[PDB]
Amino acid sequence: GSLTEDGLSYKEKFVVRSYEVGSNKTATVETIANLLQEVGCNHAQSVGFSTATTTTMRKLHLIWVTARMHIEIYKYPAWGDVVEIETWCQSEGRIGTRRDWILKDSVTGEVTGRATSKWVMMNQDTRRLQKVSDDVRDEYLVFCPQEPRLAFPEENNRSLKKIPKLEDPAQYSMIGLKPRRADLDMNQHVNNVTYIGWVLESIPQEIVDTHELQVITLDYRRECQQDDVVDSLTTTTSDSQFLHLLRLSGDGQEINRGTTLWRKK
Amino acid sequence: GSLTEDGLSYKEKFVVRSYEVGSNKTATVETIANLLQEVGCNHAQSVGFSATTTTMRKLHLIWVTARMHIEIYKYPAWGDVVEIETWCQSEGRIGTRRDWILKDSVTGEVTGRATSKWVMMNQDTRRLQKVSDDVRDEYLVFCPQEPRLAFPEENNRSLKKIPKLEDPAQYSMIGLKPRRADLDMNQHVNNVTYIGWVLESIPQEIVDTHELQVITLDYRRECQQDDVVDSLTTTTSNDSQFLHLLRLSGDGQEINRGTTLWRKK
Ligand SMILES: Nc1cccc(OCc2ccccc2)c1
Ligand SMILES: Nc1cccc(OCc2ccccc2)c1
Ligand SMILES: Nc1cccc(OCc2ccccc2)c1
Numbered sequence: 267g268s269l270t271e272d273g274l275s276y277k278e279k280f281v282v283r284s285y286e287v288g289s290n291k292t293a294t295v296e297t298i299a300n301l302l303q304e305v306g307c308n309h310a311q312s313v314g315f316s317t318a319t320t321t322t323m324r325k326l327h328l329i330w331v332t333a334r335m336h337i338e339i340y341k342y343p344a345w346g347d348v349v350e351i352e353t354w355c356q357s358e359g360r361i362g363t364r365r366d367w368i369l370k371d372s373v374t375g376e377v378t379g380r381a382t383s384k385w386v387m388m389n390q391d392t393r394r395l396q397k398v399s400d401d402v403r404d405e406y407l408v409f410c411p412q413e414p415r416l417a418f419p420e421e422n423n424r425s426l427k428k429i430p431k432l433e434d435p436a437q438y439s440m441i442g443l444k445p446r447r448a449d450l451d452m453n454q455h456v457n458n459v460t461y462i463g464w465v466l467e468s469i470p471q472e473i474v475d476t477h478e479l480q481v482i483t484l485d486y487r488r489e490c491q492q493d494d495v496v497d498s499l500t501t502t503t504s505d506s507q508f509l510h511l512l513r514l515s516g517d518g519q520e521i522n523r524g525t526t527l528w529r530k531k
Numbered sequence: 532g533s534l535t536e537d538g539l540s541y542k543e544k545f546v547v548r549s550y551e552v553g554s555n556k557t558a559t560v561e562t563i564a565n566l567l568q569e570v571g572c573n574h575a576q577s578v579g580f581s582a583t584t585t586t587m588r589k590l591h592l593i594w595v596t597a598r599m600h601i602e603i604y605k606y607p608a609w610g611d612v613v614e615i616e617t618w619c620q621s622e623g624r625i626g627t628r629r630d631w632i633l634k635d636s637v638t639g640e641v642t643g644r645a646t647s648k649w650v651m652m653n654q655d656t657r658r659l660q661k662v663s664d665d666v667r668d669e670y671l672v673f674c675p676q677e678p679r680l681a682f683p684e685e686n687n688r689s690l691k692k693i694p695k696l697e698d699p700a701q702y703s704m705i706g707l708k709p710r711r712a713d714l715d716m717n718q719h720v721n722n723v724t725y726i727g728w729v730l731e732s733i734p735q736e737i738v739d740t741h742e743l744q745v746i747t748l749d750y751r752r753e754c755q756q757d758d759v760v761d762s763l764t765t766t767t768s769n770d771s772q773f774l775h776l777l778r779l780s781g782d783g784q785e786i787n788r789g790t791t792l793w794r795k796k
């Protein structure tokens with residue numbers, strides 16, 4: 267992978283692996299999400315971040331954390347195919363930061379998917395959210411395009427829709443979900459992609475066998491700790507559309523909420 | 532990746548990814564195992580497999596793993612390039628063996644080795660059988676015909692008999708269930724998921740203070756998508772050795788047994 271000519275975006279190619287595909291021999295949405303993280307990390311490294319935070323951030327013990335992830339897939343790449351992913355970041359003033367991605371088939375050059383994520387500042391120790399200070403923005407603004415560059419430009423698009431809270435009883439559920447060590451990242455936190463998998467676990471297998479996932483919007487409200495247990499809840503709201511809710515098994519504390527849109531095969 | 536000059540082995544390079552590493556910023560043993568599967572599949576594809584021979588497809592037979600043995604000297608770091616060489620050998624009418632050698636691409640030093648024993652099985656009835664002479668003649672032309680062992684040594688760990696753990700186990704992790712990401716393209720639980728489940732019952736303190744040097748795992752029976760597993764471990768031993776057992780949560784049917792060897796950091 268490499269920074270583009272202007273140094274304001276990063277591109278990387280990936281060959282889809284045998285264990286990365288589902289029953290139709292195409293990449294799962296979790297494989298796509300993992301690739302989005304990898305190209306994101308390679309972009310941060312290429313622009314000088316140490317092995318993820320600016321100078322003012324490390325001084326105040328602040329980190330970027332995902333508040334929302336939105337992914338739209340038109341075609342899932344096949345096992346052995348080469349997918350090219352371009353990524354960039356944009357300041358959203360004092361609110362936070364946005365990271366966007368564009369996925370293309372390397373052989374045809376056609377856009378096969380797009381993603382957008384909203385990040386907010388948080389104290390690493392207290393978990394308290396904060397606005398982006400003047401000093402932090404000045405430090406990372408030089409690595410972003412300064413005029414708008416949106417993966418989802420269209421007005422009233424799906425990435426900005428407000429998601430409601432699922433009401434009990436849920437139509438479908440998968441309970442007792444727990445992370446194993448492979449679900450943890452280098453910092454021993456549950457990987458953001460694991461939550462996508464947990465959301466999808468409550469979708470009936472018949473829907474998965476007869477439909478393709480076209481869109482997924484996921485809000486991240488609270489982290490699942492390594493010793494926590496999660497219940498995944500889903501209700502059809504409709505193409506098939508679903509409303510999702512992940513909550514802690516015991517006290518019912520919300521950790522995520524989301525929506526999925528599926529197209530008939 | 533590519534076949535070597537003689538066409539009797541295959542090599543491929545992999546760059547270690549951000550989400551593939553643990554707390555020490557080095558590849559987990561499950562990431563290594565996944566890479567072993569990928570290079571294995573790329574080798575089968577390079578030698579003409581659509582992976583079953585003509586006689587195998589007619590008799591509805593497949594290769595299935597009976598045992599996996601991995602030894603790691605150094606886990607590659609995040610961003611490092613690891614080169615893996617793989618080959619197969621006929622083991623007469625008993626079955627087949629696939630071996631691997633892992634090297635640091637920059638230094639050329641051997642950083643790990645692996646060996647696996649495969650047996651023929653009817654895809655539908657799950658009944659094991661010997662390798663017929665017709666099947667052997669079909670794949671022998673893709674193997675070195677003189678011995679080529681990743682584990683040559685006389686009384687090496689790869690061929691040790693593993694006993695059955697007796698209740699009560701010293702440590703346990705109960706209620707483990709596969710999610711969709713744990714399944715392969717054929718909707719079977721991926722062989723690497725069982726390695727993760729075995730390791731779940733090792734206490735976190737051992738993981739934090741030791742590095743896994745050796746893992747031997749026997750595959751006795753499959754965990755179905757709707758099954759629940761219990762992972763059991765007892766210390767048998769500066770090095771720490773453990774005895775492992777995976778069994779179905781309800782009836783206690785054995786699915787795997789194994790051993791691990793850990794060295795102090
Ligand atoms: N941890 C990480 C690192 C780099 C980018 C990144 O993008 C946000 C995201 C990716 C996949 C799923 C959900 C959110 C996340
Ligand atoms: N923690 C983390 C992980 C992965 C990517 C990342 O992006 C930082 C960044 C790169 C380029 C421009 C602006 C910001 C931060
Ligand atoms: N499914 C598969 C495909 C190709 C090679 C392969 O090697 C055996 C193995 C690898 C990793 C863990 C346990 C066993 C397995």
Ligand SMILES: Nc1cccc(OCc2ccccc2)c1
Pocket residue numbers: 571572574575578580582583594619670673674
């Ligand atoms: N089912 C399966 C999956 C992955 C590899 C594989 O190896 C087949 C093979 C390749 C080269 C020589 C002899 C045999 C079989």
